[PDB]
Amino acid sequence: ESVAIIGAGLVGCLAALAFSKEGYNVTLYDFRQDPRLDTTKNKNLKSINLAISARGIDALKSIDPDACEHILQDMIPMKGRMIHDLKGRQESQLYEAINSINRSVLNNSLLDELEKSTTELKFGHKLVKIEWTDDKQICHFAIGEDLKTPHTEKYDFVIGCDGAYSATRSQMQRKVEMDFSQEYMNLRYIELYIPPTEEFKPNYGGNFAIAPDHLHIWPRHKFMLIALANSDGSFTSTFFGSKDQISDLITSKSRVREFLIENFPDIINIMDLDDAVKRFITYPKESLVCVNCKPYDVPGGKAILLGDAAHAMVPFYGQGMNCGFEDVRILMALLKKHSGDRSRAFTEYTQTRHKDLVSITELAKRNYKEM
Numbered sequence: 001e002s003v004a005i006i007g008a009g010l011v012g013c014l015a016a017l018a019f020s021k022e023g024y025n026v027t028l029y030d031f032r033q034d035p036r037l038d039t040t041k042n043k044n045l046k047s048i049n050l051a052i053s054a055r056g057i058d059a060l061k062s063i064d065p066d067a068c069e070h071i072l073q074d075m076i077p078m079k080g081r082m083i084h085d086l087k088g089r090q091e092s093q094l095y096e097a098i099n100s101i102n103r104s105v106l107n108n109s110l111l112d113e114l115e116k117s118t119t120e121l122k123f124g125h126k127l128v129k130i131e132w133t134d135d136k137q138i139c140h141f142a143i144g145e146d147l148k149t150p151h152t153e154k155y156d157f158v159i160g161c162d163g164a165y166s167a168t169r170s171q172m173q174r175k176v177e178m179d180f181s182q183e184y185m186n187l188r189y190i191e192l193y194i195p196p197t198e199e200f201k202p203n204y205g206g207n208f209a210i211a212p213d214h215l216h217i218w219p220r221h222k223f224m225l226i227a228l229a230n231s232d233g234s235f236t237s238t239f240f241g242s243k244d245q246i247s248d249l250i251t252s253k254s255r256v257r258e259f260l261i262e263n264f265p266d267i268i269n270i271m272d273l274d275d276a277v278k279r280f281i282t283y284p285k286e287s288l289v290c291v292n293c294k295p296y297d298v299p300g301g302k303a304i305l306l307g308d309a310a311h312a313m314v315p316f317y318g319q320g321m322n323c324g325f326e327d328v329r330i331l332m333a334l335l336k337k338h339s340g341d342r343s344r345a346f347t348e349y350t351q352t353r354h355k356d357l358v359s360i361t362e363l364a365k366r367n368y369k370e371m
């Protein structure tokens with residue numbers, strides 16, 4: 001059986017690994033170029049690192065335990081949160097724990113695992129149309145941003161792992177009556193950077209400016225800053241705030257700078273303030289979108305949506321990667337239970353996963369709106 005998987009993000013790569021392990025003929029499509037190549041300048045990394053949970057790790061394990069051990073070997077386990085107040089005082093609240101994993105390492109290592117299998121990788125291919133039939137599904141692509149060269153191929157089924165703006169989802173809406181909602185959040189995030197120290201810190205076991213084994217949080221009124229360690233001693237830092245508040249700041253350089261100094265006085269010693277200012281000013285104005293569907297599948301086991309394609313969530317308050325990895329594990333178990341009958345498996349997936357998904361996404365959304 002052949003399957004076309006649309007989207008080579010974290011979820012798409014895991015799904016491709018899972019299905020190739022079960023002996024399927026997998027073709028993995030993404031319109032981006034291969035991020036492993038130095039000629040690829042846009043890596044499409046939404047964040048440098050991620051918080052992976054016990055569920056997320058377990059999902060990876062059940063699909064390929066040897067690969068999981070290899071892929072996660074440099075993850076950094078957190079023992080608690082470190083709350084920084086307005087005066088820069090840090091309080092340690094030991095853990096619901098999470099570990100820091102590098103996004104590009106995770107994505108690229110999964111791609112590497114796929115190349116040890118029969119999986120066919122097709123970068124630079126943009127899905128534009130699917131023709132649904134009772135047999136094979138005809139997928140139409142456009143190759144390249146300039147030429148948009150046509151490519152077509154038939155598959156037994158299609159897996160939509162093409163993110164919040166899923167082209168597969170839209171194709172499926174023509175075939176089945178899908179309940180669907182998209183909502184643009186007022187939330188904006190800005191990626192910041194805490195460089196590694198020059199000198200090795202024996203108490204931290206590396207060149208870290210603050211404790212590498214704590215999730216750092218600067219909680220404030222209607223906004224917050226966080227920091228999560230990387231392997232090289234630096235921290236990936238993120239500012240979360242409303243688009244209006246951010247717009248009201250980026251009018252002048254001095255306004256942003258003063259804002260940072262006033263609210264996060266202890267980050268001055270460890271972060272390049274002027275670089276931080278540029279990041280506020282030149283940050284992508286694209287809104288975060290939350291989605292929900294029902295159903296997740298086309299009857300007859302012809303297609304299924306996983307990851308952000310099926311349930312894009314509010315960041316921080318929701319855990320999209322861990323949830324998406326769990327999508328894959330749950331799907332594969334249903335396929336096992338039904339001896340490969342995708343029609344029953346995909347149908348039961350929708351029937352049992354939807355209720356859990358809506359619960360999770362609503363909680364994440366409700367919590368962000370309570371700020």
Ligand SMILES: Cc1cc2nc3c(=O)[nH]c(=O)nc-3n(C[C@H](O)[C@H](O)[C@H](O)COP(=O)(O)OP(=O)(O)OC[C@H]3O[C@@H](n4cnc5c(N)ncnc54)[C@H](O)[C@@H]3O)c2cc1C
Nearest residue numbers: 007009011030031051127162163167307308319320321322
């Ligand atoms: C700032 C931030 C921080 C986050 N932190 C965490 C965290 O700590 N822990 C956690 O669990 N989650 C976190 N998340 C959520 C997590 O990043 C996502 O849920 C996860 O990356 C979902 O991956 P995906 O494969 O489903 O979608 P995507 O990463 O969006 O991948 C979809 C892929 O499909 C491709 N594609 C799109 N359209 C087409 C097309 N028509 N044809 C071919 N290919 C196409 C795209 O190129 C893309 O590569 C965070 C999200 C953000 C924004």
